[PDB]
Ligand binder design. Structure first.
Ligand SMILES: NC(=O)C1=CN([C@@H]2O[C@H](COP(=O)(O)OP(=O)(O)OC[C@H]3O[C@@H](n4cnc5c(N)ncnc54)[C@H](OP(=O)(O)O)[C@@H]3O)[C@@H](O)[C@H]2O)C=CC1
Ligand SMILES: NC(=O)C1=CN([C@@H]2O[C@H](COP(=O)(O)OP(=O)(O)OC[C@H]3O[C@@H](n4cnc5c(N)ncnc54)[C@H](OP(=O)(O)O)[C@@H]3O)[C@@H](O)[C@H]2O)C=CC1
Ligand SMILES: O=C(CO)[C@@H](O)[C@H](O)[C@H](O)COP(=O)(O)O
Ligand SMILES: [Cl-]
Ligand SMILES: [Cl-]
Ligand SMILES: [Cl-]
Ligand SMILES: [Cl-]
Ligand SMILES: [Cl-]
Ligand SMILES: [Cl-]
Ligand SMILES: [Cl-]
Ligand SMILES: [K+]
Ligand SMILES: [Mg+2]
Ligand SMILES: [Mg+2]
Lengths: 675, 687
C-alpha cells in the first residue's frame, strides 16, 4: 500500500502507445507511408492527431467521415521497424515499474492496440513480467475515450479505479482514465497538453523520468547489501564509467555499480585499461568474476565494456553517456589522465543530467590534486575561464574512503588461467560434434530453423555455466564512504554518506595505509610474499601492533574528537590483514619513496610524535625498512634514497635540532639493517 | 569452529595426489599404455601394485629384475608423464567422489584450509585450477619448498604455521604411508583415506580416523555440520557442483517449475552436475538443449529463476531413459494418474537396467519421489510397477528385490504451476531469435600489445586462445540478460516427503515426516476442500475461472472465512502442525488471487465423492461441531456441492438427499446434531 502525495495507492494501470513506448511517432510515419501505397495520397495530420489513443475499430469510424488494408500494411511496417531497431522504451519505464512492483501494487496495462500487437511489444521490451493482467482493444466493447477499458483493467486486478494510478499520453485516453475516477497521470509525447487535459490530470510530468524522480521520494531506499546477495535482474537505460579497470575499479567499484539502487542496474559499465590481455579476455568471455577467498565465492560481473585508455573516441563515449564515473588511478596517473578527463567533460558540455565523479585515491587532499590538474588541463584546451568554472561547479566531484583491500591478477597467472580453460573449450567443441506439438507445419518448420542456428551459436558457450574468468582477489568489506552533495549517491545501496571525510582520510592514511606499508616492508625483507602468511609470524604481528599504538597516541592529540573510535579502526585493520593470503606484499610495498614523503603515511606520524614527546621507535624502524626495501628489492640506488631522506626531513615542520637528530637516528638504522 | 569427534577443528590440510584426485590410478594406466607402445607388453598390475610407496630408483631396479636390465623404464616413465598431462589438460583432473561436498562443508564451517603436496608449485597449482578447487585453499605448501620432505613433518608443520594454527587444531588428509607419518608426527588429527592399495596395520594404528573412500568421510562429517534452513524466494543455488546426477521423470508444470528448484538448491553446500528430464514435447526438448538452460517466472515478484545443468531427453528413447535410472541418485516421478499405467513399463526397464548395471552409481540405492495429488499415490505406482517388472523379468525374487532395494517416498506439494503453451513458446523463440540476429550484426563490426611480463611465444599463444574463445563465446553473450521462460509458478517452497532415505536427510527445501498421513489430511481438508468449495461457488455465480471469481468481493470473502473455519479445527486435531497450517492458509489465498489458467470444472469434478463423511468437506464440519466452532461457511460449501451436482452434472435431487443422509449418519455426532445439520443443508440447496 504505497502513499503517493497523501493518497493510498493499491494498483497502477499503464497505457502502452506513447506512455510506456514511443511507438505513437512510428504509427504516424507508417500510416502515412502505407496510405501512399494503397490510396495514392497520405492521410491528414489532424486525422492522425485525433487518432491518438484510439482502437483500429474506433479510428476506422473517423476515416469513413473524411482503412483495414492500410492499417494492416502500416502494422506490418511498424513490426519490421521493431524487429530491426527494437521497441523504443521511454527512459525511466523499467525503473518506475520495478519500484511499483516491489511496493506490492497490483499492476496492469490498458492499451488501444489489439492483443497480438500489444503482447509482441511488451515481450520485446521485456516488461510483460511486471503486469498481472492486460486489457486490449479486442477485449473492450466500447473503446476510448469511454472508461470501460480502464474499469475492466481495475476489475481484473480485484481493485477499485480510485485505488489505482493511471498513466496516459493522449487526450482521449486521459478522459477514459479520468471518467473511470482514478488517480490520472499525464505524460507529454506528441501533443502539447490542453486546458481540458491539464484540468483532468491529478499530476503532470514532461517525461517519464520526471515522474520517477517525484515517485522516488515515497519509495524506500534499500539497506547495505550482504556479501552473496544477488544484483538486480532488470536493466535501466543509464550508463556508468570506471576510469581505471584495475584492483579497486574492477574488484570493488564494479560491485557497487552492479548493486546500484537495488531496483534497476546500469545497462552498460564502461571500464578503461591499457592492459590488452585483461581487455581482450573480458570482452571475449563477456563477463569477469571477483574472487572472495574468505568464503570461496566467485561474484560474476556482467554488462562490462572494456575499452582502451589511449582510444580517444571510446573515452569521450564514457564521459558523454555515463551518469556516474569512478576515477580509480594512483597519484602518478592523475597528471597524464587529467587531459583525457578534461576532453571528456568538454565533450559532455558540447552535447545536450549532472555527472557524479567519484575520486578513489589513497592521499590526504585527493580532490585538490585531481581538481587542480583538471582545471589546468581544461583551461589549456578550452582557452576560456567562463566554460571551465561552469564545468567544475556543474558536476559533483566527490572525495571517498575505501577500506576494502583488493588484489589484481598477474598477466602470467591470467595466461595460465586462459591456457587451462582453452583446453576445456577445445574438448567441449569435439563433444558437440520437431515432431507435432499443436502447431502448423509452417510454424514447426520455422521453429526448427530458429532452434538450429540458436543451438549453433549458443552451444559452444554452454561451458560458461561453470567456467568463470577470475581477475580479482578481494576481501568482503562492502560499504564505501563518500561526501554529501550528489542526490544520486543518496539512493545507491553500497554508498554511505559522511560529512568530515578529510578527518577519516587522515586516520585512513596513517593508521591503515601507513601500518600496512611498514609491516609489508618488514615482511618482504624477511622473505614473505603474502600479507596473510606474514601476519602468522609473531614478530610481524607484534611490529604492526606496536606501530598501531605509536600512531594512535599521536592521532589522539591531533584529533581528540576521533580518539574514541581509533581502537575499533586499528582492530578492523588487523582483522583485514590477518587472513589476506591472496594479497601480495609487493602491491602493498609499491612506491616506497612516495609513501616516505614528509606529508605521507610514514614521516607525518613520526613528526607528530616528536613534537608531542611521544615514542616513535617502531615508526622510525618502519621508515628505515622503507628505504631498505627501495634499495634492495626495487634497486633505486642508495644516493637517491639519501637525497630523498634528507629533502623530506628538511620539509618536516620540526626544529633544526630535531631535523638533524631524526636524519642521524634514521641513516644509522638503515646502515644497521644492511650491515 | 567445527567440532569433529569432541575435538575443536580450526583448519584442514589436504594431500593432493591419491587423497583429493584419483591421479595414482591414472599414473597406473599411463604406465601400462606407455609400456605397450615401447617394449611391446604392459607392466603387470601386480608389479605396479608392488611399486606403490617405493621410490623411482627401487621401481626401476624391480622392473629390471622382472623385464630385463635393458628395459627402458626412464623412457616409459617420461612417456607415461606426457600421457597424464595430455589427459588431465583436455579431459580434466580426476576428482575423488565427494571431495567438493567435503571442501564446501569445511569452508562454510569457517576452517582455514591448505594443500600439503610433494608435487612442485608449478604443476600443483595447474591441477588445483584444472579441478576448480584452488578457490577453497588459503595457502599451498609444496615439496620443492621444504628442506626435508615426507615422511618428515616439516611440510604439514609449515602448512599449519602459514594458516596461523598449531598442527593439533588441523584435520590432515593423506593416502600414502610416508604422508600419514608426516601428518601424524606434526601432531594433527590424521584422516587416512584408502586409494588403491589396502593400508598396512601400522598405518591403521597411527591414523586417528580411517575411511575406505572420501564419501565415507563425507557421511561422517555430515553428523557434525548442520542441515541448512528452508530456502527463501530469490535465494541463489550453490556455486559448487557435486558428481551426482538426478532425474525428473515427466518434465511438466510441477517437474520443471518446482522439483527442478528443490534439486537445484539440494543441500546448500553443492548441487547435482546434471538434471535429466523426460518429455515427448520435441519443441521443449530442443529449445532447452539449444539454450542449455531455462527459467521459472514468479509473477508476484516478477523474478526469473534460471535452472542450470539441465539435459532434456525423449520419453520414448530407451537408451536415454535407461541412462536416467542407471546414473541418477534421486528421481522424481511428476506424471498424472492416467500416465502411471503406461509409464510403469519404462520405470520397470529402468530399475531392471540399474540392477544389471556394473557401474558404481547403480550399487547405491535410488530415492524415488512420487509427485501426485491423490491419496495412496505411491501404492498405485508400486502396484503397476510390480505388474510391469513381472511382465518384463518373469522372476518373482528379482521383482521383489528391486521393490525393497530402493526408497519409494510419498510426497505433498502445495505450489500451483502452469506450463507454457507451444503457441506462446514459438512466439518467444521467434522474438529471442530476432535479438540473436541483431546481436550477430555487432560482433562482426584480436590485439595483444607489448610484452606485459610475457615471452613472445606465450604472447602469440595467448592471442590464439582469446580469439578462439571470442569466436565461440561472443554469440552467447546475449544469454547474460536473456531467459527461456517455460513455467509460471507460485512462491510455495516446502515439499513434504516420507522420512527413510539417507539422501533426503540434508536436502534443505525438503520437510521430512515419519508419516505423510497428517500433512496429506491437511492438504485434503485445508487446500483441496476449500479449492473445491470455492470452485462450486464460482461456477454457480457464472465465473469460468477462480482468478476472475476473486474479483467478486463475496467470493474472496467466502474463501478467507472458509480457510479460517477449517484452520481452527485442524489446529485442535493437529496442534503440532500449527505453523504449517498458518503458512499453507496464506499460500492458498495468494494462489487463488490470479488463478486464470486452471478452470473451475477440473477442481469441481466428482462433488458427491468429495462430500463423503470422511472427506475434505463433511469431515471438517463434524470436527468443528464436536469442538463447538463456527461451521456456517463449511455448511454453505456443502450445500454448493450438492447444488453444483444437480445444476451442472444434472444429478437428481432424490440422489443428493439420499447421499448426505447416509454421510451425516456416519459422522461421529450427537443424535440431535445429525438432524440439525440435515435440516439446514437441504434449505440452502433449494435456494
Ligand atoms: N586496491 C586497494 O587495495 C585499494 C586501492 N586504493 C587506491 O585506489 C587507487 C587504485 O589503485 P589500484 O587499482 O589499487 O592499483 P592499480 O595499479 O590496479 O590502478 C589501476 C588503474 O590505474 C592505471 N594506472 C596505473 N599506473 C598508471 C600510470 N602510470 N598512468 C596511467 N594509468 C595508470 C591502470 O592502468 P593498466 O590497467 O593499464 O595497468 C589501471 O587502470 C590507488 O590510488 C589506491 O591507492 C584505496 C584503497 C584500497
Ligand atoms: N501443478 C500443480 O498444480 C500441482 C501438480 N501436482 C501433481 O503433479 C502431477 C503432474 O502435474 P503436471 O506436471 O501439471 O501435469 P502435466 O500434464 O503438466 O505434465 C505431466 C507430465 O506427464 C507426462 N504425461 C501426461 N499425460 C501422459 C500420458 N497420458 N502418457 C504419458 N506421459 C504423460 C507429460 O509428458 P509431456 O511433457 O510430453 O506432455 C509431462 O511430462 C499431477 O498428478 C498433479 O496433480 C501436485 C500438486 C500441484
Ligand atoms: O588502502 C588499502 C586498504 O586498506 C590498501 O590495500 C592499500 O591499497 C595498500 O596499503 C597500498 O597502498 P597504495 O600503494 O595503493 O597507496
Ligand atoms: Cl531507464
Ligand atoms: Cl609467504
Ligand atoms: Cl620508489
Ligand atoms: Cl561428489
Ligand atoms: Cl614432500
Ligand atoms: Cl500433492
Ligand atoms: Cl496428496
Ligand atoms: K551425503
Ligand atoms: Mg496512447
Ligand atoms: Mg599422496
Amino acid at each position: 500500500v504505497l502513499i503517493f502525495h497523501g493518497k493510498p495507492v493499491h494498483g497502477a494501470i499503464f497505457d502502452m502507445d506513447g506512455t510506456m513506448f514511443d511507438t505513437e511517432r512510428l504509427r504516424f510515419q507508417t500510416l502515412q507511408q502505407a496510405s501512399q501505397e494503397l490510396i495514392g495520397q497520405e492521410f491528414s495530420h489532424e486525422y492522425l492527431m485525433q487518432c491518438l489513443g484510439l482502437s483500429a475499430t474506433t479510428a476506422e469510424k473517423l476515416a469513413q467521415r473524411l482503412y483495414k488494408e492500410i492499417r494492416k500494411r502500416a502494422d506490418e511496417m511498424e513490426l519490421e521497424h521493431i524487429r530491426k531497431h527494437g521497441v523504443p522504451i521511454k527512459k525511466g519505464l523499467v525503473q518506475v515499474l520495478e519500484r511499483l512492483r516491489k511496493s506490492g501494487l497490483r499492476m496492469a496495462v490498458a492499451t488501444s492496440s489489439r492483443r497480438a500487437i500489444a503482447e509482441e511489444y511488451l515481450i520485446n521490451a521485456n516488461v510483460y513480467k511486471f503486469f498481472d493482467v492486460i486489457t486490449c482493444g479486442d477485449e473492450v466493447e466500447q473503446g476510448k475515450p469511454h472508461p470501460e477499458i480502464f474499469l475492466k483493467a481495475a476489475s481484473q486486478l480485484h481493485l477499485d479505479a480510485n485505488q489505482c494510478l493511471m498513466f496516459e499520453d493522449s487526450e482521449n485516453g486521459l478522459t477514459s482514465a479520468h471518467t473511470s475516477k482514478g488517480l490520472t497521470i499525464l505524460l507529454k509525447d506528441i501533443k502539447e497538453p490542453n486546458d481540458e487535459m491539464l484540468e483532468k490530470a491529478h499530476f503532470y510530468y514532461d517525461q517519464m523520468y520526471d515522474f520517477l524522480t517525484d515517485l522516488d521520494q515515497f519509495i524506500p531506499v534499500m539497506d547495505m547489501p550482504e556479501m552473496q546477495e544477488p544484483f538486480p535482474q532488470s536493466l535501466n537505460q543509464l550508463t556508468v564509467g570506471i576510469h581505471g579497470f584495475g584492483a579497486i575499479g574492477g574488484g570493488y567499484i564494479a560491485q557497487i555499480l552492479s548493486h546500484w539502487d537495488g531496483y534497476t542496474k546500469p545497462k552498460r559499465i564502461i571500464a578503461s585499461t591499457r592492459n590488452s590481455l585483461f581487455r581482450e579476455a573480458v570482452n571475449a568471455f563477456g563477463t569477469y568474476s571477483i574472487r572472495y577467498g574468505q568464503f570461496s565465492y566467485d561474484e560474476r560481473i556482467e554488462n562490462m565494456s572494456i575499452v582502451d585508455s589511449d582510444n580517444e573516441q571510446q573515452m569521450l563515449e564514457m564521459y558523454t553517456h555515463s551518469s556516474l564515473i569512478a576515477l580509480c588511478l594512483p597519484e602518478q596517473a592523475i597528471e597524464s589522465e587529467s587531459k583525457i578527463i578534461a576532453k571528456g567533460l568538454y565533450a559532455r558540455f558540447n552535447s545536450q543530467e549532472p555527472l557524479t565523479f567519484l575520486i578513489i585515491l589513497n592521499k590526504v587532499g585527493a580532490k585538490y590534486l585531481v581538481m587542480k590538474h583538471l582545471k589546468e588541463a581544461l583551461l589549456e584546451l578550452t582557452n576560456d575561464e567562463d566554460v571551465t568554472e561552469h564545468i567544475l561547479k556543474e558536476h559533483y566531484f566527490c572525495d571517498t574512503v575505501v577500506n576494502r583491500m583488493v588484489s589484481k591478477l598477474s598477466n602470467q597467472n591470467l595466461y595460465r588461467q586462459l591456457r587451462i580453460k582453452h583446453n576445456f573449450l577445445e574438448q567441449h567443441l569435439e563433444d558437440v560434434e520437431e515432431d507435432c506439438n499443436k502447431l502448423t507445419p509452417d510454424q514447426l518448420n520455422q521453429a526448427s530453423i530458429y532452434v538450429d542456428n540458436m543451438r549453433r551459436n549458443f552451444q559452444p558457450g554452454h561451458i560458461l555455466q561453470s567456467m568463470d574468468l577470475i581477475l580479482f582477489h578481494s576481501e568482503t568489506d562492502m560499504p564505501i564512504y563518500v561526501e554529501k552533495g550528489s542526490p544520486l549517491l543518496e539512493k545507491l545501496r553500497q554508498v554511505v554518506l559522511v560529512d568530515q571525510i578529510t578527518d577519516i582520510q587522515l586516520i585512513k592514511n596513517r593508521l591503515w595505509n601507513g601500518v600496512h606499508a611498514m609491516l609489508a616492508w618488514y615482511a618482504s625483507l624477511m622473505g614473505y610474499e603474502s600479507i596473510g602468511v606474514a601476519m602468522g609470524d609473531h614478530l610481524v604481528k607484534a611490529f604492526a601492533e606496536n606501530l598501531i599504538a605509536e600512531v594512535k597516541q599521536g592521532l589522539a592529540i591531533v584529533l581528540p574528537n576521533y580518539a574514541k573510535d581509533l581502537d575499533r579502526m586499528s582492530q578492523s585493520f588487523l582483522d583485514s590483514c590477518e587472513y589476506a593470503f591472496k594479497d601480495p606484499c609487493q602491491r602493498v610495498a609499491r612506491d616506497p619513496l612516495r609513501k616516505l614523503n614528509h606529508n605521507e603515511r610514514v614521516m607525518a606520524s613520526i613528526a607528530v610524535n616528536i613534537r608531542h614527546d611521544l615514542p616513535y621507535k617502531n615508526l622510525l624502524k618502519g621508515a628505515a625498512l622503507g628505504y631498505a626495501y627501495a634499495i634492495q628489492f626495487l634497486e633505486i640506488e642508495e644516493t637517491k634514497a639519501v637525497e630523498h631522506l634528507q629533502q623530506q626531513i628538511q620539509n618536516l615542520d620540526l626544529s633544526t635540532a630535531q631535523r638533524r637528530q631524526l636524519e642521524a637516528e634514521l641513516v644509522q638504522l638503515i646502515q644497521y639493517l644492511f650491515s
